[PDB]
């Protein structure tokens, strides 16, 4: 029983959606699609509807479309955005040319919230706990976010948090030195670097490392954490990067307690464990949840891992119509979650 659809124009964009979804109004537009808020007549809840921009125009657009649907269909966790619905007005593979994605509608993001003023220590404990609980889940499936920043963390009035990616404040301000500079092997803990930058900003009300470019960014980071020692220099394979590092005048590591003055000492200790250059030594999400800073919230019996995720498609080079047929299969096979 294919539902009945209706059509309108919003900010120069045409939208065709089932009658289930009423009173659409624009929230935001980005590189890869635009979002509206809607009322879901079947649940009586507000939702977000994303219409992908030219989803099958090139091989790269088609693979990105497939990737976003595969990731959204996987996510079943309280602190990660989830898929409530996916539809197309198309009746056949042949007509298939538009993809719409439906999630919960959140109240605000942490960019909005910190721009107002800095947060209390109790609010920081609860927000960073929920981020790490979400990251333990996605990291357990070998999924890396890679673009964490305050605008990708969405909250309701009761402070319940979900990690999302809107797909665009500079990304470089939150990016791990090893992935920004390609200077060492990189794992899930690029995301723990971003969390440390975000937690500092929620506590102080100030961007920790507001670099103008990749060179200025590295200079601001090294002023806090210190120039690499001989033991970390051993692990850098890029001769360009090592030459550049060793061509700078040495800087000592600062005492974080002398930078974040009058913060909770357990908050300062956790920032010292997150903002380390050596990606082998940086704290994991699972280890961070057991840290004393989270004593009020930590429950080792309610921090679940994910089902395994098949990311073998990431290594494939296919034609537009192949990525399009794969995406069609995932729309057809979608099972909605419990009401
Ligand atoms: C409809 C929709 C569709 C797709 C996504 C989305 O996160 N896609 C990701 C998926 C994969 C990610 C992997 C790493 C972990 C996180 C997921 C992507 N880019 O591929 C989000 C929304 N929803 C929203 O994006 C949404 C839901 N409230 N709000 C919202 C936020 C703040 C204030 C008001 C509304 C928004 C928005 F950002 F637009 F404004």
Q: How far is CA 9 from the centre of its chain?
A: 30
Pocket test for ligand 1, best of 150, 166, 167, 195 (most atoms within 8 A of CB): 166
Question: 2 C-alpha vs ligand 1 centroid, how far in Å?
Answer: 26
Q: Within 10 A of 233 (CB to CB), how many other CB atoms are there? A: 12
What are 100's two structure tokens?
């719409």
- The last residues before gaps in the chain (C-N over 2.5 Å) are 168
Q: What is the DSSP letter of 252?
A: P
Q: Which CATH number is 278's domain given? A: 1.10.510.10
Q: Which atom of ligand 1 is nearest to the CA of 50?
A: 1
Catalytic site residue from 98, 147, 165, 269: 165
Other beta carbons less than 10 A from residue 41's beta carbon: 11
d(CA 240, CA 215): 13
Tokens read off for 217: 């960014």
Could you tell me the distance, in angstroms and rounded to a whole number, from the CA of residue 21 to the centre of ligand 1? 18
47 DSSP β-pair partners: 38, 104
> In which domain, by residue range, is 207 found?
108-294
Distance CA 212, CA 136 (A): 31
Residue carrying structure tokens 């200077």: 183
């Amino acid at each position: 029983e294919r539902p009945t659809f209706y059509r309108q124009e919003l900010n120069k964009t045409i939208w065709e959606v089932p009658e289930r979804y009423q009173n659409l109004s624009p929230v935001g537009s980005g590189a890869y699609g635009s979002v509206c808020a809607a009322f879901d007549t079947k649940t009586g809840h507000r939702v977000a509807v994303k219409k992908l921009s030219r989803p099958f125009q090139s091989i790269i657009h088609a693979k990105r479309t497939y990737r976003e649907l595969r990731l959204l269909k996987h996510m079943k966790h309280e602190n990660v955005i989830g898929l409530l619905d996916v539809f197309t007005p198309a009746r056949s593979l042949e007509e298939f040319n538009d993809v719409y994605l439906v999630t919960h509608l959140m109240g605000a993001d942490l960019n909005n919230i910190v721009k107002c003023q800095k947060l209390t220590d109790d609010h920081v404990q609860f927000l960073i706990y929920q981020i790490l609980r979400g990251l333990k889940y996605i990291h357990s499936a070998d999924i890396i976010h890679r673009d964490l920043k305050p605008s990708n963390l969405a909250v309701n009035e009761d402070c319940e948090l979900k990690i999302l990616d809107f797909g665009l404040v500079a990304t470089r301000w939150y990016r791990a030195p090893e992935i920004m500079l390609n200077w060492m092997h990189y794992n899930q803990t690029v995301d723990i670097w971003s969390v440390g930058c975000i937690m500092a900003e929620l506590l102080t009300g100030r961007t920790l490392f507001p670099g103008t470019d990749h060179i200025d960014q590295l200079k601001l980071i090294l002023r806090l954490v210190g120039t690499p020692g001989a033991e970390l220099l051993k692990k850098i394979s890029s001769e360009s990067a090592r030459n550049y590092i060793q061509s700078l005048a040495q800087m000592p590591k600062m005492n974080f307690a002398n930078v974040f003055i009058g913060a909770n000492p357990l908050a300062v200790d956790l920032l010292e464990k997150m903002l380390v250059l050596d990606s082998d030594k940086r704290i994991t999400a699972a280890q961070a949840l057991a840290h004393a800073y989270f004593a009020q919230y930590h429950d080792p019996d309610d921090e679940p891992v994910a089902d395994p995720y098949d990311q073998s498609f990431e290594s494939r080079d296919l034609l537009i119509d192949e990525w399009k047929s794969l995406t069609y299969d995932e729309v057809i096979s979608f099972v909605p979650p419990p009401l």
